[PDB]
Every structure is written in structure tokens, then in C-alpha cells.
Amino acid sequence: KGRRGKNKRELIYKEEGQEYAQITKMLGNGRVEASCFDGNKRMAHIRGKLRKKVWMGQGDIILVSLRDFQDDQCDVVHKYNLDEARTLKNQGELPENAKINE
Amino acid sequence: MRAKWRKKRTRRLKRKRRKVRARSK
Amino acid sequence: PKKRASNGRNKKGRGHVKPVRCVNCSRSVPKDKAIKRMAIRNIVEAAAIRDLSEASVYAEYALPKTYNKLHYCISCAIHARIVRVRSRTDRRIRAPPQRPRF
Amino acid sequence: GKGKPRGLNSARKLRVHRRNNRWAETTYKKRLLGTAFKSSPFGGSSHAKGIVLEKIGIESKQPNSAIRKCVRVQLIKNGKKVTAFVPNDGCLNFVDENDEVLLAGFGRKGKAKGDIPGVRFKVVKVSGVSLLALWKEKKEKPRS
Amino acid sequence: TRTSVLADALNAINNAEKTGKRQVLIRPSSKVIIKFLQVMQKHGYIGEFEYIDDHRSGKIVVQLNGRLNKCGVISPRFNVKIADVEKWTANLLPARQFGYVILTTSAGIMDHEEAHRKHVSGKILGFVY
RNA sequence: GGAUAGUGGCCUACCAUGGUUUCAACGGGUAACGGGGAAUAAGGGUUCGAUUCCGGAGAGGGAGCCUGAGAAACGGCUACCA
RNA sequence: UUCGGGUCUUGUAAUUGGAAUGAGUACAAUGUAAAUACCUUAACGAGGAACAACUGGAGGGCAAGUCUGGUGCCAGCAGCCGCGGUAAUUCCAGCUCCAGUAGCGUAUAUUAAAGUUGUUGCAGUUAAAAAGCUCGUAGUUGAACUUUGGGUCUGGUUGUCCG
RNA sequence: GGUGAAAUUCUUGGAUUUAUUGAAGACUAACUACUGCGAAAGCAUUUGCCAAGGACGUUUUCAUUAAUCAAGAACGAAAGUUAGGGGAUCGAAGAUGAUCAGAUACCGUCGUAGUCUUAACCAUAAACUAUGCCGACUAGGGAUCGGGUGGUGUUUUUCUUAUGACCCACUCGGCACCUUACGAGAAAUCAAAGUCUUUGGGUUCUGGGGGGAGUAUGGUCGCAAGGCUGAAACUUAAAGGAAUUG
RNA sequence: CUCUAACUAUAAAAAUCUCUCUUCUC
Numbered sequence A: 001k002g003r004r005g006k007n008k009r010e011l012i013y014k015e016e017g018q019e020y021a022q023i024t025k026m027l028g029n030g031r032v033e034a035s036c037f038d039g040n041k042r043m044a045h046i047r048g049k050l051r052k053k054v055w056m057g058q059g060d061i062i063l064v065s066l067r068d069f070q071d072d073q074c075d076v077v078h079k080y081n082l083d084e085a086r087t088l089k090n091q092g093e094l095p096e097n098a099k100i101n102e
Numbered sequence B: 001m002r003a004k005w006r007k008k009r010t011r012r013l014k015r016k017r018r019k020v021r022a023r024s025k
Numbered sequence C: 001p002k003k004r005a006s007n008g009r010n011k012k013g014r015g016h017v018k019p020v021r022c023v024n025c026s027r028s029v030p031k032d033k034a035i036k037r038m039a040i041r042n043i044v045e046a047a048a049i050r051d052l053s054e055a056s057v058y059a060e061y062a063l064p065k066t067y068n069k070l071h072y073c074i075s076c077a078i079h080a081r082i083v084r085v086r087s088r089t090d091r092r093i094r095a096p097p098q099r100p101r102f
Numbered sequence D: 001g002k003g004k005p006r007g008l009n010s011a012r013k014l015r016v017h018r019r020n021n022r023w024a025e026t027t028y029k030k031r032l033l034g035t036a037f038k039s040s041p042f043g044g045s046s047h048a049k050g051i052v053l054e055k056i057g058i059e060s061k062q063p064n065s066a067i068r069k070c071v072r073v074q075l076i077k078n079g080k081k082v083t084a085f086v087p088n089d090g091c092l093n094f095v096d097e098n099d100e101v102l103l104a105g106f107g108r109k110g111k112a113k114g115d116i117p118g119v120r121f122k123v124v125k126v127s128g129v130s131l132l133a134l135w136k137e138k139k140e141k142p143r144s
Numbered sequence E: 001t002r003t004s005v006l007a008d009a010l011n012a013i014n015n016a017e018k019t020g021k022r023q024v025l026i027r028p029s030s031k032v033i034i035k036f037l038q039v040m041q042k043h044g045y046i047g048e049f050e051y052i053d054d055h056r057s058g059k060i061v062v063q064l065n066g067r068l069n070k071c072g073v074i075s076p077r078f079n080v081k082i083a084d085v086e087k088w089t090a091n092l093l094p095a096r097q098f099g100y101v102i103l104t105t106s107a108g109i110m111d112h113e114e115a116h117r118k119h120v121s122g123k124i125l126g127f128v129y
Numbered sequence F: 001g002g003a004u005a006g007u008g009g010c011c012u013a014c015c016a017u018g019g020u021u022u023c024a025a026c027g028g029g030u031a032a033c034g035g036g037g038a039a040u041a042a043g044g045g046u047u048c049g050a051u052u053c054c055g056g057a058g059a060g061g062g063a064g065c066c067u068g069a070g071a072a073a074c075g076g077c078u079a080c081c082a
Numbered sequence G: 001u002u003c004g005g006g007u008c009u010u011g012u013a014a015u016u017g018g019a020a021u022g023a024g025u026a027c028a029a030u031g032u033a034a035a036u037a038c039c040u041u042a043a044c045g046a047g048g049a050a051c052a053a054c055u056g057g058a059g060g061g062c063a064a065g066u067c068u069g070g071u072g073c074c075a076g077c078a079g080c081c082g083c084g085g086u087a088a089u090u091c092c093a094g095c096u097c098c099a100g101u102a103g104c105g106u107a108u109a110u111u112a113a114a115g116u117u118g119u120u121g122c123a124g125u126u127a128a129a130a131a132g133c134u135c136g137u138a139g140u141u142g143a144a145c146u147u148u149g150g151g152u153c154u155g156g157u158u159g160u161c162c163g
Numbered sequence H: 001g002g003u004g005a006a007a008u009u010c011u012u013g014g015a016u017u018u019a020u021u022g023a024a025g026a027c028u029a030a031c032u033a034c035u036g037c038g039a040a041a042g043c044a045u046u047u048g049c050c051a052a053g054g055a056c057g058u059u060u061u062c063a064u065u066a067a068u069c070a071a072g073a074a075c076g077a078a079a080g081u082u083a084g085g086g087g088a089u090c091g092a093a094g095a096u097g098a099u100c101a102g103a104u105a106c107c108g109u110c111g112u113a114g115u116c117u118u119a120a121c122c123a124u125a126a127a128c129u130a131u132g133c134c135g136a137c138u139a140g141g142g143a144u145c146g147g148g149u150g151g152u153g154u155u156u157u158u159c160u161u162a163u164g165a166c167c168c169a170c171u172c173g174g175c176a177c178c179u180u181a182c183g184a185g186a187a188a189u190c191a192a193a194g195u196c197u198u199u200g201g202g203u204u205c206u207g208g209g210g211g212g213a214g215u216a217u218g219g220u221c222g223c224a225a226g227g228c229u230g231a232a233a234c235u236u237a238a239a240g241g242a243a244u245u246g
Numbered sequence I: 001c002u003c004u005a006a007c008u009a010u011a012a013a014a015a016u017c018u019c020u021c022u023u024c025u026c
């Protein structure tokens, strides 16, 4: 079904109100919940341009933007596919308390 | 759903709740 | 939508009819929606009459025939080709298939 | 034919029978039962003053994706809690939570308009002044 | 059971007229049908018609000329004021240039225009045009 | 018979067992004072009527009463309750 | 013969004049119990006549843009259908244009639309809906027939011939 | 045996068949149909008894006694519940041997309650013709069931009449059918779903978008299962009907 | 313008499916 579709990138760093987070489990209705690297478990919504275009699963470091009025929830934006996640761990912008390897 | 089995499910629920009523007294 | 004006039952003014078991799968069906065939056959097949004819006492024996109706559930009647899935304007023709040989 | 009575002296049933079937129209049932007075936090009011608690973002339905900037509020007139919508672009950050806000209807007779689930009401006036006045830069929030 | 014989009479008339017949057999044949048909006939929707004795309720057979278009009966004979006559004329008759609402009056069976000129009004029976 | 200005279970004494009701009594609700009316409009209707007019009721809630032709008054009293 | 007189008119111009006048002031007078205000009226009071008209809207419903720039399934709009994921006629602005106009915009009610409460005037096979069937009180409705024709006179009201 | 193939299971104590018998309860095959009866459920061996009913015939009898019908009532498939009786077949539960990834499902064998009864509850079914009942009219065609009509009719046969059974032309009533639209419907279709905007024969009972939900609650009947009655808060722009082309 | 005769015989297993829905005016 690729004929119906629209048919080596680089990482993007967090910028003043967004954070890298690790998904802990995938929730229904299209939602998800992720630990932000602050000691907090936030509730992320899979944003548009993202829903059924690029997938994500458990144990995947992924960028999420916060909403300034209600910190308890947030919306996920940009995914990182398992190789620039190591780079993210390397550059040290986020604490390395969470290593994810298989 | 078949309406038949939904009716059966609610019916069994009623039976359990009325047994709860009876045991409570 | 009412598929058949005769309701596909042929009861029409009887309330309820005794049920009869199918001959193949033994499904009970009303004795009117109970597609039914007169299985009249010679006790011996015509392919083997001659062997009987010239090797038997009682010259010019009757060679009787075996008689029985067959009652099918309509599922069997359709799968076992007893009844075909006819077309619309051809449904309202009830005459048997033109007396197979005449 | 037309299986309702037609004799001169049948008037009674023609009234009472109608007096039964009127209970089918939801408008009539609401009007006689006064369900607008027990439920529907607006006790028949077209507007009510409440206190805002927190500013929320609410998702949208399937064909439309966007974060609608809604807002919780507890109504003074009864104490109930409802959710309302901020009906312009740059106006959520006009609310200044723990603020007196005047709520109105929302364009569908006590229902949910469009793609904002679980809401029933607009927002018209914030801190006395009307919100559209702020969004047009005609008047300014008192900030008191 | 049969309730208003006039309704059955006019229903037979309309049915047999629509099919294009020329004669109609009215079965019960009570006073009101006879008066109705004399009013009809003097207006001209009907030709030379006939009553029959039967020692019981009689019978009618009525000739047509195809002049008629539709007849009908307002079975619950409503009380009409002298004012409400215009209401029925508007609601039943096609156009006031013709048509006749037939009602029973203190004078007797009578079409609406006769009722208005005699300045009397009673209960309505039917409508013909 | 009392009491009323006067009929009246209006009340008292002695009697009788009656009274109403599926033609909706009794009960419950009314964010209902009733009405003249207002909005609405092919005709038929639907909704509203706190309020410019007419009646009724009330002067915080209930009760009691003097004066006076007229009040159970309330910008008049007595008592209880808030 | 291409013309071109614009010969006759209409419009369009930051070109250009002189007329006319109120909103506002205000002599007064009237108006009123006293007064305000109106109705008159001296003198003042228009040039960008800044003495400035807003309110909604231009995808359809529904009159009006496939113009410009911005955002880029975000913000937001949208009563409903839907617009927005890099060329947005739907957001946000600018320019044009539409509708009503000192009015217009909302929200909750209610009315017509609604023949979607149907008495006039609804549907009941499958779209919601005909009690499983029958009896039956109340209710509702309930066969036909008992003085119709004739004759006269006469009051008028209409259109006759018209005096 | 049994199946698509197989296994479980019974079998030299001889299973399977081969004959006679006998027991039990079951049902009444084939006759069996676009045929009959009944209000509906439903009803199928024979015979007798008991009562009943439709339709037809009637120059018989009474004279509005009629129709539908809230309230009230009687029946009411199967399953179910009591209790007592029976206990074949077949089979919910359970036990099994297969298939499969799993299959405690469909196929396969055993097997409890039921299935059949006797008195009493249950009163629901797609209890469907998904068409309420009583009336009148409207178009052509046939047969079919019940009755009654007339044949210079046929065979019947008892010489001949009588019956019966048939043939014809009927007629009244019943289940229905075919053709058609000149009527309707949105259509599928309907001889009524026609006689409805040219809108009125008499009458009951139901519905007002879909969900929430026949759910919540209160009654009410029932031992119980549950039945009748019966919402709302709230949530949505559809759900749905018929047909067309893929 | 005379008529009413033939007939056969199959079934094992097969679960699920991520977008993207877009005008008709001469």
C-alpha cells in the first residue's frame, strides 16, 4: 500500500520547553505515557503528522513538547530511531540514568 | 452484538445483583 | 426486504407444521420448506442389468424398483446441487425442469 | 380508516391521546419536566458568572486534530463545575486563572459544537470586560 | 358494520365515475341520498336517475353523464356557523367560481350558495364539484 | 338550638349513612395570582401573560384584637417565632 | 476612404469653484409651578466638509475574492457540511467586495418553518411503530321508514322595455 | 463403529450382522398438496362416547339485540419450576477421542435435568402474513376446498329408476394463485399496501433521530426464572429503508 | 387433428491487515 503514500537525517535538540522522554508503556486511543528525564511520569499525546505515518514503541527515546498551561500532560513530536538515541546518550544533554539496549 | 446475548448478559447481571440484595439482608 | 412473495415457506394458512429431519445432515425443517425428491430407481443399475438378465432363474423376472422420497434441509439442497441458486425473474417459475427427458 | 376517532362526542380522547403523544417531543418533555432547572448547570440562564480554576487543552475528534484551549470553571450560582472554550486565537492567556468569567451558551442548545468533546459553553467576559474587547485591543484587563 | 349510508353511496359514485362507468347501484338508499341526488341533478352532475322499492330500504340506480369529477362526504356532520361556511368552501371546493358544499339546513338539504342567500346554515353533509 | 348582619355543619346536642370517583375524584408538581390581553399567522393552532386596566391575596411568618359604616388594618395595636 | 468630429449622452479623476445647510454653540422669546428640552430665531458653526459609521461576512447553505503576505493538521476558524499536514478563495493580517445600518453582532427560550403532534393534517410490510389471540364494562360510533307534491293569490329584491 | 480422514468404545465370555420372539416408552412414516379445521397457540393410526363450531340450504323465528373496545378476564409453542408416575429415543450440563497455535467449539462417541405424562405455576417467541377489527366499491383469468343449485350428461348397475363418483354451466363462503396498472407507493412490491392534497365509513393500540435502554428506580404478578409498567442525566450527524453500478 | 417413463456417486484445515480521500463550470 505504498502507492497510496506520500512517498540520512540528523537529530534535533530540545529547545526551551521540550524534553527527551522514554516511553514506558503505550496507552490506548492513540495516547502514550513517558518518563521525562526529570523524575516525572507525563502523559503524551501522539501529535498529528505523526499518528499513522511513523510508529513508535516501548523503550524508545523520543522528543515531546510540553504545554505551558497544564504541565501534567504533553504532546510527542519527534521520534529517534535507535541509533541517534546512543548519540543523545553521548552528548549528555539528558541524564544517562536510562540506558536502552537489546 | 447479537441483541440476544446482550440481553442475556444484562439478565445474568440482574441475577447476581439480586442475589447480592438477598445476601445483604 | 421480502425476498419471496410466497415467503419461501408454502405454509400460508396453517399456523404450524410438523417438522421433518433432513436426510443428509438431519436438520429439522418444516415439512413444507422441506425440499423433497421422488428417488425412484430400478433396484439394479441399467449398466448391470444384462449380467442379471442372462444369469438368473425365473425367465423375465420383474426386476422391481426401489421407492423413497428424500427430504433435504435447504442447505443440503443447495450444496448437493438438488436445488440451484436461480436468478430473479426466473425465481417465479415453479414448473420442474421441463420433464428432464421427453 | 385513519385510526383515530371521528365522532362528534369523541373529543375527550382526541385531547387526552394527544396529551399522551406530546410526551414524545424532547422539547416538550424538557419544558414540562423542567429538566433545564435540575440538570444543565445554567438554571435556564443564558449567562452565568463563574470562577476559573485551571486552563486545559482538549484534543479533537478524528478528521480534525488541534488542541482546543478550554478552561475549567465553577459556577457561582450553583457551585457546579463545567468546561468552557475560549473563542479566539490569542485569548487563553487572557484568562488569568482564579478570575471572574461570564459564560454563555455555545451555539447548539446545550450540546457540543463541532470538534470539542465534553464541553458546552463559550466564554464572553473576563474580569468584567468582554474578551473580544481585549482581543481587539479596545480595552485592557484590570489585573486586580 | 355500515355506519353512514351516505358515505357508501358517494364512495360507490366516485369509484364508478373514475372507472368511466355511466350507471351506479346505490344499495341502502335513504332519504338523505335521495335529497342529495336531487340537489346534484338540478345542478347537473347527474342525469335522470331512479329509485327502486324493495319492501326493505329500497335501492337506487343512478345514471351519469361524466359531467361529474369527484364527490365526497364529510362524515362527522360538523356544526357549521353561518360564518364558518367560507372556511369549508376554501378548504374543500377547488375554486369558488363553482363547486358546492352540501349541508342540511333548517330549510333542508341545501348547497352552500343557497344557504347563504336564504341566510341559514346547519350541519354539513358533503361536497360536490 | 347557639353564633352571624343574614342562609348555611357555620358551630353544638341528638339522630340517620350517607358525599365524590375511570365523564379522572383524592393525592403530587407547577421557576402558576386568575382575567382583559401579548408574540406568533393561508386556514386550523403554539407559547407567554410579574407588570400601565379589572378582580384576589399580603405587608418578615403565623395567630389575637380595639376603634370605626367599613380592617382581622399592619406608615394600628397584643403575643409567639426569625 | 482607418480616420474622426464625442458631433448626443453617461460615467471615472488626491483635479477645481461658488452655492445650501444642519449637528453644536448661543442673543432672546416661547415653553414650565419653576425650569430643562422641543418648536422659532439673532449672531456664530463644512473642505479631507478629521463634523471621519459601525457591525458581521466573501467554499457551500448565502450576497460577496480561487487577490497579496503570514502560519503550516500548529495556531485557529467553523451554528452544519468542513478548512488547516508548504501555492489555505474557510485561520491571521492588508487590499477589494458583500449584507444591514445608528444599528448590528451574540446566548438561552418560544413561535412559523413542523404535513417532525397531524381536528382540518402524520405514519404503523421491511425506515419508529398493529397488543399473541379472543371475550368484555365504561367511551366511541350504529340500518332503512313515518306530508311529498301539486293550484291560486300576493309582498317585495335583481335584470329586462324603458317612462 | 464412526468419519474428510481417524481415535476413543464393544468384541474368540464372540462382538457386527442372521433369524424368531418378548419388554418399555416414543411417534404416527409413506397419504402429505401453494389442501382442510380452529380465535391464536396448534391439530395427522382405528373405533366408540362426550359436548362444540364454521359454511351452505331456509316464503322459519325476535326486531337493533350492532363494531371496536380503557377497566377486567380465558387460552397461550418450546424451554423452565414444583411435586408423584414412567425412563425407549435424543441430548443442554459434565466425560471423552479428534482438528487447531490454542478449541473445555463446530465432527466423533457415552451421559445427568428435560424430552412423555398427572394437578399447579410460568405467559414469553421472528406468538410473522414483520399487513388490527367491522363495513361498501373498484379488473381479467383459471383451478382448488365446503355447501346448494340445473342438466334429456357420463359411466356407473341392481334388470332399469335410486344413491355414490364424475363432466358441464353455475352460485355462496375459505385458504390461496396467475396477468396487469388503467390505481398506489420511495422502492422492493400490493388486487389491496387501491378507493389519501380531488386530503373525512366506524373504531381501538402503538412511534417521533440513533445510542444510552427495555437499563436505573417505584409499583405490580410470580417460590424462582422472569414478565407488564418505565425514564432521565448524558452522547452523537447520523443510524436506518429500498434499489443502481462496481 | 393422437399421449403421461427414467436414475445416480464429494465436503480435512485457511487467523489478522497501518495510512490517504481529494471540483465541475460552458
Ligand SMILES: [Mg+2]
Pocket (backbone or CB within 6 Å): A003, A007
Ligand atoms: Mg508515486
Ligand SMILES: [Mg+2]
Pocket (backbone or CB within 6 Å): A045, A046, A047, A048, A075
Ligand atoms: Mg496528538
Ligand SMILES: [Mg+2]
Pocket (backbone or CB within 6 Å): none
Ligand atoms: Mg382461518
Ligand SMILES: [Mg+2]
Pocket (backbone or CB within 6 Å): C008, C009, C010, C032, C033, C034, C035
Ligand atoms: Mg419450496
Ligand SMILES: [Mg+2]
Pocket (backbone or CB within 6 Å): F032
Ligand atoms: Mg398563568
Ligand SMILES: [Mg+2]
Pocket (backbone or CB within 6 Å): F049
Ligand atoms: Mg399575568
Ligand SMILES: [Mg+2]
Pocket (backbone or CB within 6 Å): none
Ligand atoms: Mg391592580
Ligand SMILES: [Mg+2]
Pocket (backbone or CB within 6 Å): F058
Ligand atoms: Mg390586607
Ligand SMILES: [Mg+2]
Pocket (backbone or CB within 6 Å): none
Ligand atoms: Mg422585606
Ligand SMILES: [Mg+2]
Pocket (backbone or CB within 6 Å): F068
Ligand atoms: Mg368614619
Ligand SMILES: [Mg+2]
Pocket (backbone or CB within 6 Å): F074
Ligand atoms: Mg394582618
Ligand SMILES: [Mg+2]
Pocket (backbone or CB within 6 Å): none
Ligand atoms: Mg397600609
Ligand SMILES: [Mg+2]
Pocket (backbone or CB within 6 Å): F076, F077
Ligand atoms: Mg399603632
Ligand SMILES: [Mg+2]
Pocket (backbone or CB within 6 Å): G051, G052
Ligand atoms: Mg461625522
Ligand SMILES: [Mg+2]
Pocket (backbone or CB within 6 Å): none
Ligand atoms: Mg472571519
Ligand SMILES: [Mg+2]
Pocket (backbone or CB within 6 Å): none
Ligand atoms: Mg470588514
